[PDB]
Amino acid sequence: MREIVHIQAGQCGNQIGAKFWEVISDEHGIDPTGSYHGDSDLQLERINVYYNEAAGNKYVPRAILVDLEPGTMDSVRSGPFGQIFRPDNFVFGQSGAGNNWAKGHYTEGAELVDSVLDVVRKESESCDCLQGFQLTHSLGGGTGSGMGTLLISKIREEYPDRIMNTFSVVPSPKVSDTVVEPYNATLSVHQLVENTDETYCIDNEALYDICFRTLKLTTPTYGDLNHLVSATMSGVTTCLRFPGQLNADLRKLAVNMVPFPRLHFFMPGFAPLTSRALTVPELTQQMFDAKNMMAACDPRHGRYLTVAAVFRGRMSMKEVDEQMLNVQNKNSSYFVEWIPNNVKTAVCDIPPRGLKMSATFIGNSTAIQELFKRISEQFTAMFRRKAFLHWYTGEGMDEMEFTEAESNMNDLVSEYQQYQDATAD
Amino acid sequence: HMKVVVRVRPENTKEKAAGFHKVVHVVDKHILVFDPKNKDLKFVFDAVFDETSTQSEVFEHTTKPILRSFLNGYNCTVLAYGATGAGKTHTMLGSADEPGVMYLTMLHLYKCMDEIKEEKICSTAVSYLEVYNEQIRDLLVNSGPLAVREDTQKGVVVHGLTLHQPKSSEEILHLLDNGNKNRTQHPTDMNATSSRSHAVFQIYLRQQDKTASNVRIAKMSLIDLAGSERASTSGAKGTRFVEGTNINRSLLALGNVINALADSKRKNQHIPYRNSKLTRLLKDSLGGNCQTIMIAAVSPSSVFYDDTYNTLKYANRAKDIKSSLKSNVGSDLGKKLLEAARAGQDDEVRILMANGADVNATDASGLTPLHLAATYGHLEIVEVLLKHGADVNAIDIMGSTPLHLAALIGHLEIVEVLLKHGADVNAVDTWGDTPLHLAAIMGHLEIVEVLLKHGADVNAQDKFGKTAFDISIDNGNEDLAEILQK
Amino acid sequence: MRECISIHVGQAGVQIGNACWELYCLEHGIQPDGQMPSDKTIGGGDDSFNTFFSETGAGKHVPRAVFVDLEPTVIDEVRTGTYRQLFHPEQLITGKEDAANNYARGHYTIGKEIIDLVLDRIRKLADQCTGLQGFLVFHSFGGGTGSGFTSLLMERLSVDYGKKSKLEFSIYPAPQVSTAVVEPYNSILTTHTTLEHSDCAFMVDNEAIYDICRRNLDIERPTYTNLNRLISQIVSSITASLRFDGALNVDLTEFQTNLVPYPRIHFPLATYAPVISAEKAYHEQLSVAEITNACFEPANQMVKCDPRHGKYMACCLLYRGDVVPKDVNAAIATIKTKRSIQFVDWCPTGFKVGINYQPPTVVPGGDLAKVQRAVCMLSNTTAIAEAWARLDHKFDLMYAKRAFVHWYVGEGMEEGEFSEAREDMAALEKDYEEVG
Numbered sequence A: 001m002r003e004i005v006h007i008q009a010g011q012c013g014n015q016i017g018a019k020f021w022e023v024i025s026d027e028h029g030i031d032p033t034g035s036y037h038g039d040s041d042l043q044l045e046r047i048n049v050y051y052n053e054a055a056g057n058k059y060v061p062r063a064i065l066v067d068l069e070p071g072t073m074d075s076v077r078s079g080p081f082g083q084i085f086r087p088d089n090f091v092f093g094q095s096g097a098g099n100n101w102a103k104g105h106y107t108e109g110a111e112l113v114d115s116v117l118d119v120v121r122k123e124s125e126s127c128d129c130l131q132g133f134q135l136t137h138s139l140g141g142g143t144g145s146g147m148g149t150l151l152i153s154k155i156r157e158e159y160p161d162r163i164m165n166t167f168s169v170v171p172s173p174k175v176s177d178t179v180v181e182p183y184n185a186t187l188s189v190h191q192l193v194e195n196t197d198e199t200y201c202i203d204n205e206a207l208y209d210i211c212f213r214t215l216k217l218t219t220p221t222y223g224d225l226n227h228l229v230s231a232t233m234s235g236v237t238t239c240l241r242f243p244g245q246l247n248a249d250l251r252k253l254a255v256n257m258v259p260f261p262r263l264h265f266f267m268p269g270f271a272p273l274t275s276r277a278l279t280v281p282e283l284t285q286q287m288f289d290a291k292n293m294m295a296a297c298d299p300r301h302g303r304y305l306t307v308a309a310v311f312r313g314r315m316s317m318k319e320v321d322e323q324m325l326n327v328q329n330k331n332s333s334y335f336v337e338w339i340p341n342n343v344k345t346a347v348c349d350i351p352p353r354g355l356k357m358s359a360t361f362i363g364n365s366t367a368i369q370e371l372f373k374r375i376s377e378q379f380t381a382m383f384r385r386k387a388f389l390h391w392y393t394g395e396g397m398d399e400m401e402f403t404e405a406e407s408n409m410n411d412l413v414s415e416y417q418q419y420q421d422a423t424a425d
Numbered sequence B: 001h002m003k004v005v006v007r008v009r010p011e012n013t014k015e016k017a018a019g020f021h022k023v024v025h026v027v028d029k030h031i032l033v034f035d036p037k038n039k040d041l042k043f044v045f046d047a048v049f050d051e052t053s054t055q056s057e058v059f060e061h062t063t064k065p066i067l068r069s070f071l072n073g074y075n076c077t078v079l080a081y082g083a084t085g086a087g088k089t090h091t092m093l094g095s096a097d098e099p100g101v102m103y104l105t106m107l108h109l110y111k112c113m114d115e116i117k118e119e120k121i122c123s124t125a126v127s128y129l130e131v132y133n134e135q136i137r138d139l140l141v142n143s144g145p146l147a148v149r150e151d152t153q154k155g156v157v158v159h160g161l162t163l164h165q166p167k168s169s170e171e172i173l174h175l176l177d178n179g180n181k182n183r184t185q186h187p188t189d190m191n192a193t194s195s196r197s198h199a200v201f202q203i204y205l206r207q208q209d210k211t212a213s214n215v216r217i218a219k220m221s222l223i224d225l226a227g228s229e230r231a232s233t234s235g236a237k238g239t240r241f242v243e244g245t246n247i248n249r250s251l252l253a254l255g256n257v258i259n260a261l262a263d264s265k266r267k268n269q270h271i272p273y274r275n276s277k278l279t280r281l282l283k284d285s286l287g288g289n290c291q292t293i294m295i296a297a298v299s300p301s302s303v304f305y306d307d308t309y310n311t312l313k314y315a316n317r318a319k320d321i322k323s324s325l326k327s328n329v330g331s332d333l334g335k336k337l338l339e340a341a342r343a344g345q346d347d348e349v350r351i352l353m354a355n356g357a358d359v360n361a362t363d364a365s366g367l368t369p370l371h372l373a374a375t376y377g378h379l380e381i382v383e384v385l386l387k388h389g390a391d392v393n394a395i396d397i398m399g400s401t402p403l404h405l406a407a408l409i410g411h412l413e414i415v416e417v418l419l420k421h422g423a424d425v426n427a428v429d430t431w432g433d434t435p436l437h438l439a440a441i442m443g444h445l446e447i448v449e450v451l452l453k454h455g456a457d458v459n460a461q462d463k464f465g466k467t468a469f470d471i472s473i474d475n476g477n478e479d480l481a482e483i484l485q486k
Numbered sequence C: 001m002r003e004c005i006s007i008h009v010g011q012a013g014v015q016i017g018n019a020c021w022e023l024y025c026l027e028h029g030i031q032p033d034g035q036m037p038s039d040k041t042i043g044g045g046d047d048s049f050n051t052f053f054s055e056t057g058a059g060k061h062v063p064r065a066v067f068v069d070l071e072p073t074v075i076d077e078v079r080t081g082t083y084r085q086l087f088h089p090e091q092l093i094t095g096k097e098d099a100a101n102n103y104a105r106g107h108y109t110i111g112k113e114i115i116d117l118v119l120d121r122i123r124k125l126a127d128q129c130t131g132l133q134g135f136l137v138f139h140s141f142g143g144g145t146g147s148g149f150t151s152l153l154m155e156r157l158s159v160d161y162g163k164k165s166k167l168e169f170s171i172y173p174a175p176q177v178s179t180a181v182v183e184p185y186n187s188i189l190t191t192h193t194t195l196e197h198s199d200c201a202f203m204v205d206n207e208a209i210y211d212i213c214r215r216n217l218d219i220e221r222p223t224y225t226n227l228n229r230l231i232s233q234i235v236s237s238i239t240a241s242l243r244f245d246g247a248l249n250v251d252l253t254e255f256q257t258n259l260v261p262y263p264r265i266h267f268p269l270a271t272y273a274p275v276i277s278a279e280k281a282y283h284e285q286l287s288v289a290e291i292t293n294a295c296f297e298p299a300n301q302m303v304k305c306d307p308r309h310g311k312y313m314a315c316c317l318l319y320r321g322d323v324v325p326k327d328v329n330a331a332i333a334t335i336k337t338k339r340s341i342q343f344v345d346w347c348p349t350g351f352k353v354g355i356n357y358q359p360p361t362v363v364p365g366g367d368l369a370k371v372q373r374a375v376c377m378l379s380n381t382t383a384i385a386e387a388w389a390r391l392d393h394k395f396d397l398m399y400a401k402r403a404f405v406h407w408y409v410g411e412g413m414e415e416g417e418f419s420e421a422r423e424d425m426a427a428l429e430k431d432y433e434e435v436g
């Protein structure tokens, strides 16, 4: 269990993807040319997880960049770390998706997909022990969600033994391009529920709320939102990229985090929240706080099935242990009793840039039903009136497919409700 | 209550020579004992079939009794369950010599229809599918992987599944035979007959009184499940291993469905149908509005002790699954103006109107040019229509006004123009929604304020009793909730 | 004399192995390169330590040991470490990827790829034996490899070496050190799958060792290295008789005879004393009386349970060091008058005694003080049922919801195997109930 293949699709996908590589490359001490210039051997012990070794000391991200419009990969190429990516791994079309899931999944996206799969398969062949795939994308657009989920199903079909993970950005009216975003998001959720092992739910609603209320930015940009995304993605992947024995590979994380097939949507959390030194008691406290969640749900409204906590920087593992036991003792009701020992903690010596100590939280909470309920009602409001159906049916889609996606996402909510109430034994 | 039956197959040559005592003991036709004097467990079933059981006898006490009710418009299901080699394929689809329950069921159904032709007209629509590796495949016409879709009206439907219309017993039996051959069955040296997939034959009956002096419809499902396979006991690898995994997972899914349905004390609680394609197909067939019969197949031998015990526990538990049964039962220029209004073609609109197009034309749903223009954000066409006698408060067959639609989609300028021309700020559609509700749900805050300014009722409630304020609370939408606070 | 082969499976098995074999070498004067100056017969020998070590013509003493893990990380450390030259390379077997804390991956999917290779390597060792007694198998309950692969190995060994003895050292999980939520599943599955293939199994509760390290050794946050050193001292005491030609437990069969009257109830509780910090080496040496009494203090047990409210089926006391037989007989005679003890109907009230005169050895890193005398009590008590109950309970909580079960079924297991496993455990708890 060594190599992970990274895929970024659509505008949002390529934006946060790039930022992720900027951030992690710095952490691993790799320059825009792909040369190592770091301090500790700790940065190189598991570099192969994200980077291939090339002729020289050259480290190249195992990253594939996808979009149905050219513009975004021109901006990716002409960015701080643009030169680090394998030129053969840029798969771009011309037409665009026009924020239409159908175009992403069935037409324009479907005619670019084999080109992507070629690059994935090539990257795969040069892997000693492939863990699986991580896809970053938005759920609200056309390429990220339509093509992304088509890509996911094609990869699931081709590599059934491998772990499929996604970083999925959920849409919000507060940061809205369109009102078809609910349609796009729900169609994708239907795809994600079937075809993903682990989905990190990054919620634009939450990212905005954090930037506006906590960070007190009058009008937040994408750079602002993306700063929180990069931090979260860095923190969530630390256990994969540095030495350790807990959630150290994709499969071990899944077995620890996912009790039921369909219930594999995680609320990411981060502390501290900064905009462009906490005591471990404070760090642990803020993690489980509603204000620090990257999905716009209140954890206090649900119960945790499983949790993975990750502390970064020089701190006492003993102190962490006491402080995590504290939280489970003080707030016993928030943790399902029918899964003994469901909170796992890890410490990593290397902190993220600009912080001496930090914490990242990954929760499988039943409170995520709030996210799905919010999308569901927006979807229903629109679907009842049949607004813009022609956009989708015009691309060969059946109306029944909308009904199917609605049914499923509602069933997911209901399935979450059962375990929030499943105290009785 | 779901009906449950046990068929103890006769010991094969492999079990005879071993000479290990029989664990399954048939006492009554209702009673069986599992491990006699050892556990010594008394099980009560609706029917129990011994080693000398014929196909006819099984049929006589399973489907045959229900075929009357099927004709009277009652849904039916027979599903063969149990461990590998227990004899469920034998029971369902029979041998070359000996016909199975499926054959006998279909033969007798058509005989019945022939005897009552003068009293009732019957037509049958049939399909035969295979659940293989979490994929559905049509066994009659070689169609690819098929999608499973669900409405709360039609239930679970297999998109692209070919429906056939046999009119005789010989026709339906031909389709049965065609499918049986198309079914994925791998001839192994270890195991001659082991099912790799779940066979599901469905029969859709339409029945009417002959003079029609009200049609009765019913679905009958005949299912031959593949049995679970221990990768140790068998030692499967390659494609056979994947087969085993998928089968075992479907049976895990089925297991969970049975447990959740049975003695649930929680009818309000979730049932994990979506965990498998198999359990999705069986959704309307497990304890709903359906007469369901489980034929639980078992070996009598000690060799399959655990296998047999597992079958019986699940069979016994299926008995507690409760079911509630019931017999089932303008102008040419108008069209153009609608399309033109939808597409936002200002010039085509003017021209169509100049030629006398009905500004208040309706499509099949009762939508007007104004509705469509309001929906798709064509301000200029909105004004043009209103200036020439459009009903600003027209409703479609769902109660939507132009303002509902402009509010939903978030067209601020249109919302204002509609109101200024006397839009009903508090019109209610069939879902109990007002413009305020819709603008709230979609997070259009500027529209919300405008709606409130023009006297939108903050106390109006949808079908589910929710006001705009309630919605904002149930959404954690503080921006919205803040403005509605009074 | 008759040889014993040690098999170490998964991280725990391997890391315990490291600690055991280091200690063995120290006890027999063997160096990291396998050179033992004090052995004058270079070719071979009939010596007592030869049960555990074979001999090469270059005077090299080689563990009769196989190390097996499904991933290489841990065994790679052995291959690169201080004791690399100790083993024939073939004895250190690694696969490509682990079992991901999944019994089914260890038992079927990944394990089946390597099982035949492992049996070949074992066979190579068995062929160098003039009279193989059987196998000592070290593994975690909680690991995918420790649970799944061990089960598989034990099945195949029952077929390929039918008449050979098989003893386990099993690491029972604790939340303090655990890294997998599904460890209760792995434990129950492996207990049931292994039960009929194991003659005697010594369980080590990670929680107990952790507690002892914290309390007696003043260690702030015990690592596996700390746990393993303590464990190895307990393993050493148990296997001493095999390696130093004792009078009690002279061969593997005798373990069963002396500890296991009823086949399924084959889980002796180990208690060990004394465990003292080196920061207290200056104290007065504890007597035979003092250490014998410390065998009845629960805090010194290897598994958490209450023997005082249970019944004994057998009880061995294994003394090591400066121990006079008469002093032992005095201490034992005295135990009756502390009135703690109660035996089952059909079993004798005797405490069997073994004495070896070798003083305990501590390793370089050790926190444990070197003492003149130590004892390990092996008692087959119905109290240990409490350990199974705690473990069965955690199983029940999750299995009621079928939590995580899809991970196992997705690896070619039937749901039914969970039922079968859990029922065997219910029968085992009943077995303990009946003998009471």
Ligand SMILES: Nc1nc2c(ncn2[C@@H]2O[C@H](COP(=O)(O)OP(=O)(O)OP(=O)(O)O)[C@@H](O)[C@H]2O)c(=O)[nH]1
Pocket (backbone or CB within 6 Å): C009, C010, C011, C012, C013, C015, C016, C069, C070, C098, C099, C100, C101, C102, C106, C140, C141, C142, C143, C144, C145, C146, C147, C171, C172, C173, C174, C177, C178, C179, C183, C206, C224, C225, C227, C228, C231
């Ligand atoms: N005493 C002790 N316990 C250990 C050690 N290493 C792991 N464990 C325990 O063993 C369990 C984990 O099983 P491992 O041995 O790590 O797993 P494995 O056999 O390698 O299996 P996979 O990694 O799942 O293939 C947990 O209960 C750990 O606390 C060790 O060195 N000593």
Ligand SMILES: Nc1ncnc2c1ncn2[C@@H]1O[C@H](COP(=O)(O)OP(=O)(O)NP(=O)(O)O)[C@@H](O)[C@H]1O
Pocket (backbone or CB within 6 Å): B008, B009, B010, B082, B083, B084, B085, B086, B087, B088, B089, B090, B091, B193, B194, B195, B196, B225, B226, B227, B228, B297
């Ligand atoms: N009632 C029966 N009378 C006589 N022979 C039987 C009977 N049931 C089963 N058999 C024999 O048992 C064999 C295997 O039974 P079969 O019905 O194919 O098993 P199954 O339950 O469908 N197995 P599987 O599909 O793998 O779950 C057949 O080839 C028959 O010869």
Ligand SMILES: Nc1nc2c(ncn2[C@@H]2O[C@H](COP(=O)(O)OP(=O)(O)O)[C@@H](O)[C@H]2O)c(=O)[nH]1
Pocket (backbone or CB within 6 Å): A009, A010, A011, A012, A013, A015, A016, A097, A098, A099, A100, A138, A139, A140, A141, A142, A143, A144, A145, A169, A170, A171, A172, A175, A176, A177, A181, A204, A207, A222, A223, A225, A226, A229
């Ligand atoms: N957080 C974040 N969301 C973005 C970004 N760019 C677009 N989005 C969101 O993504 C959705 C639109 O999908 P997008 O990726 O732009 O379209 P695509 O290129 O067709 O996949 C909307 O919900 C936007 O708010 C970005 O840089 N950051």
Ligand SMILES: [Mg+2]
Pocket (backbone or CB within 6 Å): B088, B089, B090, B193, B194, B195, B225, B226, B227
């Ligand atoms: Mg069959």
Ligand SMILES: [Mg+2]
Pocket (backbone or CB within 6 Å): C010, C011, C071, C098, C099, C143, C145
């Ligand atoms: Mg391991």
Ligand SMILES: [Mg+2]
Pocket (backbone or CB within 6 Å): C039, C040, C041, C042, C043, C044, C045, C055
């Ligand atoms: Mg010698």
